[PDB]
């Protein structure tokens, strides 16, 4: 998984150098990208290049312009469409560009991350490895760089999926989030974290339980009081499993 993540990161700037000739020029460039990515029947190679050009623009300093985040909102539909494409080339490029947006904007990717996250979670159970992995890596990159509390319920809600794959990944994501985010980023969501981890500890799946226990101790390190309380509501067998 570390190699796939590194592969995305290396791809971030493997895109053409572009110029931004004005605020108007930037808006029109993003308008053109929206047009290309919003058409179901538009040439797939041209869609890959349009997704790459978003990275080009970031590298040209687009994020500095007054209206940039207005422009980025406009691409909500484009990202969803791209991440749902039949062609993994398009899906994968979209996930790379989403990861790049997160790494460049950090916490200012708050709106875009929340808007696209359910769509990329829908990749997780795909039986095609390239499809699933692209979505997994995009989520991990977003969690790593965009520490936004509103993302926590989106992630935890998938803890309870009928798809075992989604459940396993969910607790992998949660483990990563607890390890990467500061305590203050978690304080509005203590209860939902505790209940989500509680459900994972009792999960029917063995791999899911193992990840949930990682989550428990991550959670404990932030909130020992609340984690100890959760611990003592557990039957004896689960308490011993946690101590292992």
Numbering used by the authors: 295 to 538
Q: How do the authors describe this structure?
A:
Two prime animal MAP families that bind tubulin and are recruited to microtubule plus ends by EB proteins (either directly or indirectly) are the Cytoplasmic Linker-Associated Protein (CLASP) family and the XMAP215 family of microtubule polymerases. While XMAP215 family members promote microtubule polymerization, CLASP family members promote microtubule pause, potentiate rescue, and limit catastrophe. While the CLASP and XMAP215 families differentially affect microtubule dynamics, they both employ an array of tubulin-binding TOG domains to regulate the microtubule polymer. While mammalian XMAP215 family members contain an N-terminal pentameric TOG domain array, mammalian CLASPs contains three TOG domains (TOG1-3) followed by a C-terminal CLIP-170 interaction domain (CLIP-ID).
To determine if this architecture was due to crystal packing, we determined the structure of H.s. CLASP1 TOG2 in a different space group, P21, as compared to the initial structure that was determined in the space group P212121. This deviates significantly from the flat surface observed across XMAP215 family TOG intra-HR loops used to engage tubulin (discussed further below). Comparing protomers determined in the P21 space group to those determined in the P212121 space group showed little structure deviation with low overall Cα pairwise rmsd values that ranged from 0.3 to 1.3 Å. CLASP1 TOG2 is curved across the tubulin-binding surface and our structural modeling suggests that it may engage tubulin in a hyper-curved state.
